[PDB]
Design an enzyme around this catalytic site. Structure first.
Site, short mmCIF file in Angstrom:
data_model
loop_
_atom_site.label_atom_id
_atom_site.label_comp_id
_atom_site.label_asym_id
_atom_site.label_seq_id
_atom_site.Cartn_x
_atom_site.Cartn_y
_atom_site.Cartn_z
N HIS A 60 25.49 70.44 -19.50
CA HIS A 60 24.91 70.33 -20.85
C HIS A 60 23.82 71.40 -20.94
O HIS A 60 22.84 71.32 -20.19
CB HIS A 60 24.43 68.91 -21.13
CG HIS A 60 23.89 68.78 -22.50
ND1 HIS A 60 24.70 68.86 -23.62
CD2 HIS A 60 22.63 68.55 -22.94
CE1 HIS A 60 23.95 68.73 -24.70
NE2 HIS A 60 22.68 68.51 -24.31
N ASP A 62 21.29 73.17 -23.56
CA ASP A 62 20.59 73.24 -24.86
C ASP A 62 20.32 74.71 -25.21
O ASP A 62 19.64 75.43 -24.45
CB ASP A 62 19.32 72.39 -24.82
CG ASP A 62 19.55 70.91 -24.67
OD1 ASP A 62 20.45 70.38 -25.42
OD2 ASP A 62 18.87 70.28 -23.75
N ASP A 174 25.38 64.70 -26.89
CA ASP A 174 23.91 64.68 -27.00
C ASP A 174 23.35 64.49 -28.42
O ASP A 174 22.21 64.08 -28.53
CB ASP A 174 23.29 65.91 -26.35
CG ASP A 174 21.86 65.61 -25.90
OD1 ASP A 174 21.59 64.43 -25.60
OD2 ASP A 174 21.05 66.56 -25.80
N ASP A 308 22.25 67.87 -17.51
CA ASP A 308 21.54 69.03 -18.10
C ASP A 308 21.42 70.15 -17.06
O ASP A 308 20.88 69.90 -15.93
CB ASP A 308 20.19 68.56 -18.64
CG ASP A 308 20.32 67.41 -19.62
OD1 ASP A 308 21.43 67.18 -20.09
OD2 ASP A 308 19.32 66.74 -19.86
N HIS A 438 21.06 70.38 -31.84
CA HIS A 438 20.45 69.02 -31.86
C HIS A 438 19.01 69.03 -31.34
O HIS A 438 18.42 67.95 -31.31
CB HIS A 438 21.30 67.98 -31.11
CG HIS A 438 21.64 68.36 -29.69
ND1 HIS A 438 22.79 69.02 -29.37
CD2 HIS A 438 21.00 68.12 -28.53
CE1 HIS A 438 22.80 69.28 -28.07
NE2 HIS A 438 21.72 68.72 -27.53
ZN LIG Z 1 20.99 68.40 -25.58
#
Ligand SMILES: [Zn+2]
Length: 1005
Positions: A60, A62, A174, A308, A438
């Site tokens: 994951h 971001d 997420d 993550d 997100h």
């Molecule tokens: Zn995330």
């Protein structure tokens, strides 16, 4: 076309209905804290009924959260993808899924041709599998469906171009709650399956108990079920390894082999798998797998393996891979298990599940509804991010419009690559797409990352402006004359709503003088495919200005002062040197109209002047330079304004709406605006960027003696007031009024400012809110749930209604909102929070800044509207409320010609464009080809909404295939434009059903 109003769909799970009969008891369930002790009969399994286990490694990533996109790339992601490339190449059975194409494109373009060709082969043999393939994994609450489509298209267009793949399985692990807008868009973009995670713990339990975690997710209005998309909802607290192997994180955490500065909260470490321990470890793990499998209907089981920014170091790849190989090796080699386990991908999981369904093993339930508002535990509802960093939430809607307008305006022609149109539009789409993340539009990122998102959207806004101005100049300059300098500003844009004068006094004044410069050309753009007449305004150096079209036909105008608000208490100041000229621009469908502002010595025949009344105690007078109507003074009192045949509004002596008379012979229906405060719990759980944990109902804001400005004109009147934190303003132009709040929460720590409307509308516990500005969903206020659970996303609009009346609030920005009592609407303006809410962001929200929030307020009679069944889970706007939303989201674009003289000037473009039915929109017009391509292709997305019929016309079929000349063909396509679904023999676009969205691509010779 389906009727979407009287036929209530029949589904196994309807979330609103389910919510009513759910108890939401937060029982301690055991090792699975939010469920129960799962039992399986172990004679379920044998040699002819094996469990098939797909262990799916994932990372994951971001694109901004604690770090910026570029920070995370350099520190984490480029190592993750380098290692994915190396390890997958060397290990043919090893597998990996990847979601965020923003990071993948950044990585891929930096590779050598060798690596690039190595990457393609591990994508070609299905070792590295792209899931969703959006630029980001977007927010689903605050995002406009247009930007969801934009970021999906950006990611998948990149994948088609550079990997020749188009994912058909979505991965959304997420986002903080889940929208049916995603299956809607995905099912029309070729997708067959989607995965979700972030749903309320009571919902995971309720559905897990009925094995309703896999479902055919249809839209809430869809009778036939053509919108249906297969959805896997993951059953546990999180997507991490402790929460993905089975119901007992203490066991699962021991199969996270990177945890041997990482450890297990439950205090039992992973152990290297050996011949010594493999039988014991396999027993522990298969027992977890078989418990998880009880929750689903097939003998096929999805086991995500990641977290993550995982799979960064070369050794994390080894330790996860080798230990799982030994386990699989033991487990598959031992018949007593009746398990086949292996590394797999998400598509492999879904393929296997559909083979089981086809073979009669499971038939799946149908679901309609949304998964808002999400709670991860007890009373920690994620309604805070519906409002966090509302400045950037507003900026998203503004940039949404500028990308559409810039793409549409420039689509009309091919540009020589010297112009760099393609590069601007690509930058602009990508910065907007990245903000859909997100932790972007959500306002859940660290201060420095929010700053980066903002600087990116600022660049993007400026790239759109340059494309828009070059386009207008080409569209309205005689071709015999058109001779462009591509780096030249032919027009500057004028925007009275972003950032807003009060956030930044930086609109240009048009300086006129009879010697120096007597006249100025302005141009309005109308991105909507129908004729629009909209009041526009410009700053001018004199009040003696007249408006004409380019044919010198006079146009009626009003001149108001420029007002500013200041602070010791809070009072207005008038400009003595600039004025507002206001007039009705009439603009063709997807078209342009030119007008001329001309100075004179004195009051021109066709320009009226607004009065100004400064309802303040203890006055001291205000000059307004050459403005002819001297400001009047007076003590605070009640006031009643009307404009045109439009509503008559009454106001308190604090300049807050008290009532609305629709027609002249109708009643003064009460409608009280009111500002309140929510604060933060001193004891226990603190509100943050994500969580809304209020300390009881909101309490009134002390208004004091507020200075109330009243401006009264033929075309526009307004009531502004200086409240503490908010300059509140009601603007009237002859229909639904417009509300403007300059929100400066300043230094009020642990405060959330809400704006409530109090009516006598008999709504009961019913209100409606929109999802991604695409559809309106019925909410029921549930007294059994705490306050923050009755807060829902307001991305576009909310409304209450009874038998006779409806009141609809439309928003220019996504914000949190509820109807906490009968006949009320409330919507949060901003929030400042000293404390962190302990979801890993490691800060509160103390970076607030002035934002101008924009609304429209539509009071209406619906007793003569065909309203849907009382059992229907959806609501629909009226024409009035839909057009009011269009005026917020996609207003006329204003251009001021930069130079003294404009040789070539034409007065109109698109006069011959078809004026389509009010419920149809050309959401996207985008040219798909550069100049050096022998067949020009243009993509169109059409959305037809659905409007409540109340019986009221005269329009003309739009066919986007013929909009441009020399159409050689056109195709109905996926919404990404990436697949042809129907060769159109007519080269005509067939008409589009209510609530339907369709894409076409027209080819030109
Ligand atoms: Zn995330």
């Amino acid at each position: 076309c389906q009727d979407v109003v009287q036929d209530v769909p029949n589904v196994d799970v309807q979330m609103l209905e389910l919510y009513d009969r759910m108890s939401f008891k937060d029982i301690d369930g055991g090792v699975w804290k939010q469920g129960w002790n799962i039992k399986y009969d172990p004679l379920k399994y044998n040699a002819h009924h094996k469990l098939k286990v797909f262990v799916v490694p994932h990372s994951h990533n971001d694109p901004g959260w604690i770090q910026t996109f570029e920070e995370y790339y350099q520190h984490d992601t480029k190592h993750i993808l380098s290692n994915a490339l190396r390890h997958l190449h060397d290990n043919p059975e090893m597998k990996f899924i990847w979601a965020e194409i923003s990071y993948f494109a950044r990585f891929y373009h930096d590779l050598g041709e060798n690596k690039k060709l190595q990457m393609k082969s591990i994508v070609k043999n299905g070792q590295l599998e792209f899931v969703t393939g959006g630029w980001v994994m977007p927010d689903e609450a605050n995002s406009h469906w247009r930007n969801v489509l934009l970021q999906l298209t950006e990611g998948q267009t990149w994948l088609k171009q550079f990997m020749n793949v188009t994912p058909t399985a979505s991965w959304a692990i997420d986002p903080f709650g889940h929208s049916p807008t995603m299956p809607y868009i995905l099912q029309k973009s070729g997708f067959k399956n989607m995965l979700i995670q972030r749903t309320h713990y009571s919902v995971k339990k309720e559905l897990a108990q009925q094995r309703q975690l896999e479902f055919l997710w249809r839209q809430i209005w869809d009778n036939k079920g053509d919108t249906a998309l297969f959805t896997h909802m993951m059953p546990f607290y999180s997507y991490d390894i402790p929460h993905t192997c089975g119901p007992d994180p203490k066991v699962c955490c021991q199969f996270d082999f990177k945890r041997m500065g990482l450890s297990c909260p439950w205090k039992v470490p992973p152990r290297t798998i050996s011949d010594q321990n493999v039988a014991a470890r396999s027993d522990l793990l298969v027992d977890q797998w078989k418990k998880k499998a009880e929750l689903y209907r097939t003998n096929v089981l999805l086991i995500p393996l990641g977290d993550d920014f995982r799979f960064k170091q070369n050794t994390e790849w080894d330790v996860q891979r080798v230990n799982y190989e030994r386990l699989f090796e033991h487990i598959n080699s031992q018949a007593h298990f009746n398990v086949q386990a292996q590394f797999g991908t998400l598509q492999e999981y879904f393929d296997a599940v559909h083979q089981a369904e086809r073979a009669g093993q499971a038939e799946f339930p149908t679901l309609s509804g949304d998964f808002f508002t999400y709670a991860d535990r007890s009373d920690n509802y994620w309604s805070g991010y519906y409002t966090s960093r509302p400045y950037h939430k507003r900026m998203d809607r503004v940039l949404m419009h500028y990308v559409r307008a810039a793409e549409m305006l420039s689509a009309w022609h091919s540009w020589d690559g010297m112009a760099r149109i393609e590069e601007r539009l690509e930058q602009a789409r990508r910065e907007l797409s990245l903000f859909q993340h997100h932790d972007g539009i959500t306002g859940t990122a660290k201060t420095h990352v929010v700053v980066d998102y903002e600087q990116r959207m600022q660049e993007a806004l400026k790239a759109c402006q340059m494309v828009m101005q070059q386009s207008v100049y080409r569209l309205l300059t005689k071709p015999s004359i058109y001779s462009p300098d591509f780096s030249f500003s032919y027009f500057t844009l004028d925007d009275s709503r972003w950032p807003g004068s009060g956030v930044e006094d930086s609109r240009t004044t048009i300086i006129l003088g009879e010697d120096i410069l007597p006249s100025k050309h302005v141009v309005m753009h109308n991105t909507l495919p129908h004729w629009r007449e909209q009041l526009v305004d410009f700053y001018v150096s004199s009040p003696f200005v007249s408006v004409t079209d380019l044919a010198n036909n006079p146009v009626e105008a009003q001149v108001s002062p420029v007002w500013s608000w200041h602070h010791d208490t809070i009072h207005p100041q008038g400009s003595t040197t600039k004025y507002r000229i206001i007039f009705k621009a009439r603009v063709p469908p997807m078209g342009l109209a030119t007008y001329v502002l001309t100075i004179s010595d004195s009051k021109p025949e066709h320009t009226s002047y607004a009065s100004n009344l400064l309802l303040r105690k203890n006055p001291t007078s205000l000059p307004l330079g050459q403005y002819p109507e001297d400001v009047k003074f007076g003590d605070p009192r009640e006031i009643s304004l009307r404009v045109g045949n439009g509503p008559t509004l009454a106001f308190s002596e604090q300049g807050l709406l008290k009532s609305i008379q629709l027609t002249q012979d109708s009643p003064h229906v009460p409608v009280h605006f009111k500002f309140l405060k929510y604060g933060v719990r001193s004891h226990g759980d603190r509100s943050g960027a994500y969580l809304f944990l209020p300390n009881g109902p909101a309490s009134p804001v002390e208004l004091g003696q507020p200075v109330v400005l009243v401006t009264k004109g033929k075309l526009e009147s307004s009531v502004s007031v200086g409240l503490p934190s908010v300059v509140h303003q009601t603007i009237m132009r002859g229909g639904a009024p417009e509300i403007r709040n300059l929100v400066d929460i300043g230094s009020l720590d642990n405060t959330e400012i809400v704006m409530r409307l109090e009516t006598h509308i008999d709504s009961g516990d019913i209100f409606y809110t929109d999802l991604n500005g695409l559809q309106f969903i019925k909410r029921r206020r549930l007294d059994k749930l705490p306050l923050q659970a009755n807060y829902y996303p307001i991305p576009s609009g909310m409304f209450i209604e009874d038998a006779n009346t409806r009141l609809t609030l439309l928003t220019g920005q996504p914000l949190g909102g509820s109807s906490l009592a009968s006949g009320e609407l409330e919507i949060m303006q901003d929030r400042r929070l000293a404390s962190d809410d302990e979801r890993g962001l490691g800060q509160g929200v103390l970076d607030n800044k002035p934002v101008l929030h924009i609304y429209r307020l539509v009071l209406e009679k619906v007793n003569n509207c065909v309203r849907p069944s009382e059992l229907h889970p959806a609501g629909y706007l009226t024409s009035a409320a839909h057009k009011a939303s269009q005026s917020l989201l996609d207003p006329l674009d204003k251009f001021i010609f930069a130079e003294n003289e404009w040789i070539g000037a034409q007065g109109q473009f698109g006069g011959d464009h078809p004026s389509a039915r009010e419920d149809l929109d050309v959401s996207v017009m985008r040219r798909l080809t550069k100049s050096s391509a022998k067949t020009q292709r243009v993509g169109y997305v059409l959305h037809r909404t659905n409007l409540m019929q109340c019986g009221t016309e005269h329009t003309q079929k739009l066919d986007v295939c013929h909009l441009l000349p020399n159409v050689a063909r056109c195709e109905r396509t996926t919404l990404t434009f990436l697949q042809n679904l129907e060769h159109l023999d007519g080269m005509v676009a067939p008409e589009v059903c209510p609530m339907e969205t369709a894409a076409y691509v027209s080819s030109h010779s």
